[PDB]
Amino acid sequence: AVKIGIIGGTGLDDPEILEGRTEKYVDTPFGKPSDALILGKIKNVDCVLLARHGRQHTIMPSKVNYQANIWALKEEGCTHVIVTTACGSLREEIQPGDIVIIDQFIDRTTMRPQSFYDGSHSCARGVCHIPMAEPFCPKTREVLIETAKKLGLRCHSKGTMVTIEGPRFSSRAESFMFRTWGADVINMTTVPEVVLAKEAGICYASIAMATDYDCWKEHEEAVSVDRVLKTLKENANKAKSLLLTTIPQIGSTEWSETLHNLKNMAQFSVLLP
Amino acid sequence: AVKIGIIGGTGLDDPEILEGRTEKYVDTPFGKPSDALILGKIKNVDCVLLARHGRQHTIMPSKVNYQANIWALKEEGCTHVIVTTACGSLREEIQPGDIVIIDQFIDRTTMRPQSFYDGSHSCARGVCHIPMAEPFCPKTREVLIETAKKLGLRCHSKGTMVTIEGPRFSSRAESFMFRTWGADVINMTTVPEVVLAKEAGICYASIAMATDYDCWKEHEEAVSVDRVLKTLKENANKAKSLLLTTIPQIGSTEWSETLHNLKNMAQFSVLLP
Amino acid sequence: AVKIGIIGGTGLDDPEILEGRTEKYVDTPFGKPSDALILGKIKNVDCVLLARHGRQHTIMPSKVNYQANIWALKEEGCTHVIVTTACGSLREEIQPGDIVIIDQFIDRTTMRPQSFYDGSHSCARGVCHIPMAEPFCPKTREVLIETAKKLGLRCHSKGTMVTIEGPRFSSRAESFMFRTWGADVINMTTVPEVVLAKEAGICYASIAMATDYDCWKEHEEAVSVDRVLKTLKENANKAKSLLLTTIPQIGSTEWSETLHNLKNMAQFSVLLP
């Protein structure tokens, strides 16, 4: 049995993706999630949808309760979490509208709790040092990549996401610098979402959709809210189709060994007194 | 009509620059500014002076209320904010005493709110993603550059400021690293001052004065408080003369289109529910 | 007269190193230290041992009270602080079990107060900008290096420590990136411990013990809690022997000039109103 949490990003958090929808507000030891969980199905597969920024997009990236969001999805019984994220492209070949099935990140966030194990919650006791060598689930990523190909979508099979604190966009000097560091795409939301998913023993993968070229092409038009929303209006259907087609494939394959290994990695990362 | 906010940095916050001075303590939704606003004039031009660190230099860079400072200047009616900042030079050709009319930044701060739109203040509602491709006002920068030339001052027409959290100075490894990133000068105060000014729709420019070579020349003497204060004692007059000569030129030119464009960029950066 | 504070890191905080041990719980203006101070001697030399993470390793690196730890050691009369830290190796030639007598750092922490001079404590008044060009005491480092040679230990005479916030380990993209920045070893605890020691006018040095190769060798096994603990179990004796042999040598040499210079640097870094 699998159950797929879906965290929807900017313009990419469409409830209509699920059949048989039921709204469920929940609480967690880390506070309230961004919004109600939306329980439903894609074909025969149980899913739980959550809008990262709230359904009215009222929560800025620095203020998203990443701990509560991941905790809530885990408590609801999610084995997998597949997310969408709007992002800037830091590479000419990653064009706006392209999907990037990211496999690494570089953290530039500064304000965010990145662990459940903060010494303040009885539900998560001890000191946890989670490994981040492979932050994203390779098996889920492989299904996303194969499915994007079956759909004929422009899709990149790897990429490094730099996550900035925001909510401002990057300066041009920063944008240039991130390119030198080997970042391929830029957002404000991957970290610590991916980190907390790993601590929870959840298979996490991210559908990154390039919405802009940030500002590293000084000759070309630079990113803005309006530019991002426009690209999402034009391209969001691609992420919807990718989720709708990927999720039944995830449901049809065996995950016990993968989930056992993730559970072990999470459990063995915790030092108890 | 223009009104010029002046934020004075270390050793560079001299009230005597203004004629017809009146002290005005104010409050903001983000708390109190660093000190009283000093209202006055330079020739026919209305100005508002504020000491970044307080007039007795009692506020460390991490604790400066950047939100209140920018809010206060905006509420007083400032169209422009021109600031001074003491900084380390990361380039041999930027000598102590030189002015750098910075055009980019790299953020290394970690502790600081960078937006008015934090979801907690009724006066700034929504999620704001401000563009930072061009953080400083090019028209104001151009007047500063031309004026420095008219004054015969050693002045660099561009530069990237790395802003560190502080209050410690950088290690040598950090200083070396910032050079590789393309930083030209180093301080503790540009970010988030420049970011908040952009959200406020204010034309912001910075007169950076090199006070030291940080510590990247291992053979040469490294930065200290005493070294910085000495260089400022010797060179502060240059920033005073630059402000006094620049501000009347700003007053004599037309800003409506520039200010309209900045207002539009700020307004369109805000996502409402 | 010297008195040596010893801050023990992961698996490297063994009370049995001291003869004539007495437990002393203390308070500081910044709160409680990680655990009781352990007063004792190594040969004729007064020492004060403190477990960085608590004696049961219950305190994660982000939550260590670096201010209280350094304050407590200073108040107890420590002239020197020599610490141990487990770390990842970012260089092929730094093998697990090797000691690195680090001489520089790169800060990647985001959550931590780095100064005593926060404008909130009467015991530390003013704005302090401490120099970090030479963060570690070269004379103490030289004794550690010479002593490691006398013991026949694999020991590196310099190295740059990147300190990450944690508690997660780095991603592979981050690990690669830190190598390009010139970091040699990676931990979660050097900053701000070294910074606060400098503000306190204490001679600080660090015995870094490589416990893993982080994750930059994609072909090789990546870091985990279990891997780190295993390497420490096998190699901790080396740090114990190094401390036991170094400390009497520190006791036998003259420190007045070194300590006077550090005191002056600390005092002159403070700007009073």
Ligand SMILES: CCCSC[C@H]1N[C@@H](c2c[nH]c3c(N)ncnc23)[C@H](O)[C@@H]1O
């Ligand atoms: C309407 C929302 C305006 S775009 C800003 C939002 N979408 C992501 C984003 C898209 N493009 C970016 C870029 N170039 N830099 C940083 N973040 C982003 C980011 O995670 C943030 O939540």
Ligand SMILES: CCCSC[C@H]1N[C@@H](c2c[nH]c3c(N)ncnc23)[C@H](O)[C@@H]1O
């Ligand atoms: C008396 C004040 C001692 S210098 C420290 C102050 N002046 C700036 C500064 C000058 N030189 C620097 C340097 N090398 N690194 C970082 N910041 C600085 C910085 O913005 C800070 O507010």
Ligand SMILES: CCCSC[C@H]1N[C@@H](c2c[nH]c3c(N)ncnc23)[C@H](O)[C@@H]1O
């Ligand atoms: C049982 C404790 C598991 S290892 C984690 C602890 N030991 C240090 C460490 C060892 N190897 C590291 C690495 N590769 N990256 C970051 N930090 C570390 C670090 O300061 C942290 O306190």
Ligand SMILES: [Cl-]
């Ligand atoms: Cl950084």
Ligand code: NA
């Ligand atoms: Na922070």
